[PDB]
Amino acid sequence: KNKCVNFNFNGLTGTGVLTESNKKFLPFQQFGRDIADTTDAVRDPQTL
Amino acid sequence: SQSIIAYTMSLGAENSVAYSNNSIAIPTNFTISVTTEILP
Amino acid sequence: VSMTKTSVDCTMYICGDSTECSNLLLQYGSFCTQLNRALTGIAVEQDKNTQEVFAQVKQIYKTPPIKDFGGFNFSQILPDPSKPSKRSFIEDLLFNK
Amino acid sequence: TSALLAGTITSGWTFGAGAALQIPFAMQMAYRFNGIGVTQNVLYENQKLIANQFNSAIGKIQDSLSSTASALGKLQNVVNQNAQALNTLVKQLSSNFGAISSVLNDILSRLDPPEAEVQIDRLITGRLQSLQTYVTQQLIRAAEIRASANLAATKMSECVLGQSKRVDFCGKGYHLMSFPQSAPHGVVFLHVTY
Amino acid sequence: IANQFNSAIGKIQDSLSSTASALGKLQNVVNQNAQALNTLVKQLSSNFGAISSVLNDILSRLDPPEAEVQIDRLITGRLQSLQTYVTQQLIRAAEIRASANLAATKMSECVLGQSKRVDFCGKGYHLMSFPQSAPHGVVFLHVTYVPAQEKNFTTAPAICHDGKAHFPREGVFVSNGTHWFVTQRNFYEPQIITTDNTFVSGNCDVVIGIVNNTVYDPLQPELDS
């Protein structure tokens, strides 16, 4: 966290910095998107 | 003894003048000016 | 009067951190460089348009402490010095609508 | 903007022609009434009416702007036109342009070198066309805004720093004075007319 | 005035001879025009994904079944580089066209007449103008009138002579502390307050700011004739 790193998740890839936030993902949701179809949030597949 | 400096831009000095119900400022002299203006 | 000043990296928009893509883009010429000069030239005009409009006077003036203007109430047009932003009540309506 | 008010309200038309000369406001309008072929007896004899009419007219501007949402439509279109160009610029990245996939990683990590270069050549040629379409659009929109600013620059000189004899330029009717106000990416003039 | 004018002409020669940045508006026209013409020539040396940028490198080297594919890439690239040039020059002509219509307007109002548009024909009160030619442009020398030295005076809108309010015809009333005169707004040329320099309207019980003073009657000395 707080470091420029790459991402290889179960269903998400890219490059960026991870930070804690107040967002919430449903139990049937993994990763979010903004208005421009770009990812701006993700839930960890192992931790809650 | 020189260097580069950063500052907030100035908008010009302040020349607030007196105001009242009975005072007027009339000029006494004049001066002719010649300003240049270039246009393509 | 003005527009939103913008600039776009012609490389990162096309090649998102891809060395192979960038190596091929380098063979297309100065298409990449031209687009940065155009948008940069546009951003300068949006900074000139405010000087050619608002800065009609190099000299700054101010109102007196006693606002006697022959019965005309300019309190709605003049700025509110008691507010954090030195703007008027009508300017507040414009920056909010 | 606060300076041009303090100059117009108290110095009139002189601060736009050299040094600022003091003139009372009730005496300013007398010249302005004479500036439109009206003798200045009507002003001094009816100062109470001119003030109550002006102050009442300023109040309508607040109620009108605070109620009419379509009043600032000119400045909102400038913002909406730009944002549509930005989102359109980003949405084109998701398009394939006739390729296997819009993502380079799905091609660079999937196909061999001599095959991936052809698929990549289309996205480069496609995405590069979206930029020239964007740049050319903003380069035309910068011309319309440039004429609107050169117009407003004239109105901040003729209407504000003086009195205009041009009809319907500084407002409908015989013009007396103007009072500018700022706004996001624009100006708003409060023309006074007889 | 003749010496103030001839002195200002000498300063323009000094500023134009020293400050080369005065004519920066005209240098941006030739520079931008030259950069675009140079950009096309540089685009010729680009391959656009082909084997080589030169035609003879492909015509006599590869066969027509394969040369037509490589040749099509250059024609596709070099043609877009023209549309980018013609489009830019076709937009720049509009900005030039707006400047010409403006300069033509100034050559009509400011030169062939005396304008009353504020800050249009030069800063200050406009008197006349003198045009001067230049490469790919035009130059104006706006002669103007500017008051320099000021003095505070006590004024008033009207004067009460004998029940009637005497407003001025031209200028405005002033006071040197004890005595009242009439003077033009833009220059101090005091005159005696008389019926010819005034206009009667109403009475003193309505106008605000009025003062009591005497108006000289030109028919005064004829009474003792």
Question: Nearest CB to E48: which of C27, C30, C56?
Answer: C27
Angstrom distances, CA of residue E219 to CA of D130, E194, E216: 87, 11, 9
Min Cα distance D72 → chain B (Å) is 28
For residue D54, the tally of other CB atoms under 10 A from its CB is: 17
Q: Is A5 helix (H, G, I), strand (E, B) or coil?
A: strand
Min Cα distance D102 → chain A (Å) is 13
Residues in chain D within 8 Å Cβ distance of E97: none
Altogether, the residues listed in chain C come to a count of 97
D94 in contact with A, Cβ within 8 Å: yes
Residue whose C-alpha is closest to residue C18's, from D90, A9, E73, D123: D123
Min Cα distance A35 → chain D (Å) is 9
Helix-helix angle C89-96:D47-67, to 10 degrees = 20
Return the residue matching tokens 């009195």. D163
CB C90 to CB D10 under 8 A? no
Token pair recorded at residue D173: 């009717």
Token pair recorded at residue D131: 């930029």
Is residue E139 within 8 Å of residue E133, measured between CB atoms? yes
Q: Is C25 exposed, middle or buried (0-12, 13-18, 19+ CB in 10 A)?
A: buried
Reported for D127-134, long-range contacts at CB under 8 A and 24+ positions apart, including other chains, are: D127/C13, D127/C14, D127/D92, D127/D93, D127/D97, D128/C10, D128/C14, D128/C28, D128/C31, D130/D88, D130/D89, D130/D92, D131/C8, D131/C10, D131/C13, D131/C35, D131/D89, D132/C31, D132/C35, D132/E84, D134/C8, D134/D85, D134/D88, D134/D89
Question: Nearest CB to D45: which of E152, E185, E206?
Answer: E206
Residues in chain D within 8 Å Cβ distance of A37: 91, 94
Q: Is E158 helix (H, G, I), strand (E, B) or coil?
A: coil
Q: Chain C residue closest to E92 (CA)?
A: C38
Residue whose C-alpha is closest to residue D159's, from D167, E130, D81: D167
Min Cα distance B37 → chain D (Å) is 16
CB within 8 Å of chain E, chain B residues 1-40: 18, 21-40
E201 in contact with D, Cβ within 8 Å: yes
Angstrom distances, CA of residue E63 to CA of D118, E12, E47: 21, 68, 18
Residues in chain B within 8 Å Cβ distance of E137: 38-40
Touch between D and A (at least 3 CB pairs under 8 Å): yes
Return the residue matching tokens 């005396």. E114
Phi-psi region of E153 (alpha: psi -120 to 50; beta: other; left: phi over 0): beta
Return the residue matching tokens 């620059």. D153
CB B23 to CB D22 under 8 A? yes
Instruction: Dump the DSSP string for A13-30.
Output: EEEE-----S----TT--
Q: For residue D40, which amino acid is it?
A: Q
Q: For residue E23, which amino acid is it?
A: L
Reported for A36-44, long-range contacts at CB under 8 A and 24+ positions apart, including other chains, are: A36/D87, A36/D90, A36/D91, A37/D91, A37/D94, A38/D90, A39/A12, A39/A14, A42/A7, A42/A9, A42/A12, A42/A18
Tell me how far apart the alpha carbons of residues E59 and E77 are, in angstroms, rounded to a whole number: 18
Q: Is D5 helix (H, G, I), strand (E, B) or coil?
A: helix
CB E117 to CB D44 under 8 A? no
Is residue D121 within 8 Å of residue C22, measured between CB atoms? no
Q: Chain C residue closest to D8 (CA)?
A: C61
Is residue E16 within 8 Å of residue E122, measured between CB atoms? no
Question: Nearest CB to D108: which of C18, C38, C45?
Answer: C18
